[PDB]
Structure 1
């Protein structure tokens, strides 16, 4: 018998198949590989800090959820165990792009779990009532946003507490910020996409035509339940969280579509989260941990219940009934799978955490008019370069 520990930050909310109930099915069938999964008791950004303290203390879990944007960071801090041959055994159970994001320098450190493509959530019934359509161009988007804002309804958000992924994702839909050239990281967060995103959100904020409530504040939930928020860009895994936040408002009326051609992106979209599960330094059971993890990550209907757009290609889960009930009977998982397939490549630098922390601060100022949306991307540039220099890494800008 071997005992495995798995630390995760899956929501485990009402209506979901709880992680402990998924693990229970494994534990009944595999007496020699016994798993205990624990939900991290803290906000998402504190989890890799806990993994670092745990690995230093010599008491880390075997397995831990690591965002794709976090892999380079935990790799650089020496937190990962090479499981290349174990991962190769399970490669055909997963999509190639997310599997590649669990790799550094031809070595694999775990299995991918989900992807986080950005899409557009909107009240389709309300759009039809108000005489509007999903805007096809940035200029149409701004004109339509001003028209709804005149009657106290909003078709866009600017979420200062989600600046890291909302600004990097909408900008990143049209090209990378970070590249590797020989020995160095090459940093440019002021791309054509960054300029386009700043221009669009600057016009929306100048015209009081996007809601600036932080995503994780009660004001965001109140905006949905009160009927004020009738459209927003959103990460695909927000679907169940958004439904719960709505408190029944819009049930049977909403739909999902692709991110529009608003930021010079055409039919492409960006990445907002999405994670794998890494094998940590000091794990005494990588082979058994990876056997369990391949099984876990291919429990497609249970993982979709948690809001995951799964990396697994072993089976296809139907849109959960809870989601299609909310979203007008729409097959929203088909829209999420299309969005995933249109997600532009976007390599993350080690220390992207620190870049997000600084971007959040500037975005609060852009939201209240004390800074420009473009300053968020300048903050990203300077904090990107300073973070790389502080990690002792070679950086060019």
Structure 2
């Protein structure tokens, strides 16, 4: 009797894929973007608490899945997924499993890449294809800002996910969980990758080379990408779909290169990457699962790549529509040549191959990333050393873990 489901998600391809699902099945998909990352999670937490108003399906990033799964908020879908290890790439598949059970299906992955506005870089005297090391990026940042006081190599108003990703990139692993999830060590204040990232970003902050006012996912963020005042992004491989749909005016001016690394070594991290989960509260579990399967495993997979997301599955990596992609279909189906003809998935596939293994999320990343700004904000809007904020963040996370029943060590 189910003729409609409710979905919360911000991935820009989901509107098209949901419309395609409606055409195929006759099931109405009531899709809402209720906020990006932590803004969505606040709303999901509120609906979970209230016992009412949750969607049947939500977009939940890999880093957030442990907290939701451990608390019993996601439906165990293990019995639907027999052959899925063979379908999905290993990182995404590992990330949807908590304590032996599958709680979501991967929909995209976020190996990082350096997206840059070639027009702005060239005008500033920077070769965006020659940014191999973090020092190269620092030197580029000075040249970009020399264009004028409003021009910055990128923006960072104080984002936890970026901090965590750059720690990973630099070889760090400040979070460890063992013993079926009961024993957690946090050593942000000692981890060498954290230290290396802090030293790098602290210099750019100190020299006022970053836009610390613009908040990610706001309109001014996309305006900056259009007008050149946010000249580049060190971010996940999902960015193309967002550039195409939300920064269309700069189409043709941007390019993709591999992430710069601390010393030019081959290394990468992931930033973001998402799954779709059925909420445990859903009275429409079968229809919710059927929708997720279409998006994440069936014909939605190809649509997702063609509309600018990076795949979570093995076959897409070998598919012609991935490897030989140049133009990206926007939300209206029009082919947009955002990267000026670049075979951008040649770079993104290499970016994925370069990701360092072994990194782990905390079992409470929704909490951890939600409070990052409480401890670190003054490092981005003020003079507080990053290292001081990180120490205060670690103490808060240890205390929270203990209060929630984890055995916490440093």
Do Structure 1 and Structure 2 share a fold, with TM-score over 0.5? yes
Contact 2:165/2:269 (<8 A) preserved = yes
Please, what is the CA RMSD of the aligned residues?
3.0
| 1:207 CA drift (Å) | 1.9
1:69 paired residue number:
63
- Out of 149, 153, 157, the position equivalent to 1:156 is 153
Give me the whole-angstrom Cα distance separating, in 2, the residues matched to 1:135 and 1:41: 36
Give me the whole-angstrom Cα distance separating, in 2, the residues matched to 1:348 and 1:146: 33
Question: Is residue 359 from structure 1 mapped to residue 372 from structure 2 by the alignment?
Answer: yes
1:321 paired residue number:
327
Summarize the Cα distance change of 1:293–1:36 in structure 2 as closer, same or farther, 3 Å threshold.
Answer: same
- Gapped regions of structure 2 (runs ≥ 5): 330-335
Summarize the Cα distance change of 1:4–1:143 in structure 2 as closer, same or farther, 3 Å threshold.
Answer: same
2:21 paired residue number:
23
| 1:260 CA drift (Å) | 0.9
| 1:126 CA drift (Å) | 4.3
Give me the whole-angstrom Cα distance separating, in 2, the residues matched to 1:177 and 1:265: 22
Contact 1:116/1:309 (<8 A) preserved = yes
Give me the whole-angstrom Cα distance separating, in 1, the residues matched to 2:167 and 2:361: 14
Give me the whole-angstrom Cα distance separating, in 1, the residues matched to 2:151 and 2:132: 17
When normalised by structure 2's length, the TM-score is 0.82
Contact 1:65/1:277 (<8 A) preserved = yes
Give me the whole-angstrom Cα distance separating, in 1, the residues matched to 2:355 and 2:79: 28
Contact 2:134/2:261 (<8 A) preserved = yes
- Out of 172, 175, 192, the position equivalent to 2:172 is 175
Summarize the Cα distance change of 1:375–1:359 in structure 2 as closer, same or farther, 3 Å threshold.
Answer: farther
Give me the whole-angstrom Cα distance separating, in 2, the residues matched to 1:293 and 1:91: 16
Contact 2:153/2:232 (<8 A) preserved = yes
| 1:116 CA drift (Å) | 1.8
2:102 paired residue number:
108
The total of aligned residue pairs comes to 387
Matches within 5 A, 1:1-397: 5-12=5-12, 18-28=16-26, 34=27, 36-52=29-45, 54=47, 57=51, 60-133=54-127, 134-152=130-148, 156-161=153-158, 163-173=159-169, 174-182=171-179, 183-190=182-189, 191-212=191-212, 213-246=214-247, 248-249=249-250, 251-262=251-262, 266-283=265-282, 289-298=288-297, 299-304=300-305, 307-315=308-316, 316=319, 317-318=321-322, 319=325, 321-322=327-328, 325-344=337-356, 345-397=358-410
Summarize the Cα distance change of 1:48–1:88 in structure 2 as closer, same or farther, 3 Å threshold.
Answer: farther
Give me the whole-angstrom Cα distance separating, in 2, the residues matched to 1:221 and 1:10: 15
Summarize the Cα distance change of 1:390–1:156 in structure 2 as closer, same or farther, 3 Å threshold.
Answer: farther
When normalised by structure 1's length, the TM-score is 0.85
Summarize the Cα distance change of 1:320–1:60 in structure 2 as closer, same or farther, 3 Å threshold.
Answer: farther
Summarize the Cα distance change of 1:75–1:227 in structure 2 as closer, same or farther, 3 Å threshold.
Answer: closer
Summarize the Cα distance change of 1:24–1:118 in structure 2 as closer, same or farther, 3 Å threshold.
Answer: same
- Gapped regions of structure 1 (runs ≥ 5): 29-33
Give me the whole-angstrom Cα distance separating, in 2, the residues matched to 1:158 and 1:202: 14
